[PDB]
């Protein structure tokens, strides 16, 4: 979660949060408890991941 750097620093370059929290994990927990749509969203996500 943290970053620090010594005096050679210019830019933020914190892409630790395109790794874990920001993009998916908080936008997922904005909306409803189903049990049902996730079983089919994961079903078609794993059925789309195919060659």
């Amino acid at each position: 979660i943290k970053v620090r750097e010594n005096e050679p620093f210019d830019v933020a370059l914190r892409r630790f949060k395109r790794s874990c929290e920001k993009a998916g994990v908080l936008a997922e927990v904005r909306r409803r408890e189903f049990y049902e749509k996730p079983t089919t969203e994961r079903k078609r996500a794993k059925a789309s991941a195919v060659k």
Binding site: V3, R4, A12, R14, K17, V25, R30, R32, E33
Partner: protein, 117 residues
């Protein structure tokens, strides 16, 4: 006044508004500025521009403390936050840490229903 010389910039980016609170390392607030309090009410208070002018305006109003070092703590998602920390090192601050402190439940409370828009 009181001459703290190090603080924390808690930026609270949400989808509708970013609210920047500059405090000390004890956690006592020294002065805040919101994107909605800088003109541009409404669809324009959730933009990176509004967040950066909110952060410029929060860098003002803590001149009475002589803050040079600060950590940055970032909550929430938002069109803000990224631009926000930029405005902080456009205001002479030595930005030391950038932590992202978004609250994530370990499957806690049930989130609200919504949005069949």
């Amino acid at each position: 006044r009181k001459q703290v010389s190090d603080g924390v910039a808690h930026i609270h980016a949400s989808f509708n508004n970013t609210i920047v609170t500059i405090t000390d390392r004890q956690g006592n607030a020294l002065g805040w500025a919101t994107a909605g309090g800088s003109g541009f009410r409404g669809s324009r208070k959730s933009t990176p521009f509004a967040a950066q002018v909110a952060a410029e305006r929060c860098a003002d109003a803590v001149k009475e403390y002589g803050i040079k070092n600060l950590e940055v703590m970032v909550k929430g998602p938002g069109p803000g936050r990224e631009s926000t920390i930029r405005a902080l090192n456009a205001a002479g601050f030595r930005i030391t840490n950038i932590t992202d402190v978004t609250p994530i439940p370990h499957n806690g409370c049930r989130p609200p229903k919504k949005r069949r828009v």
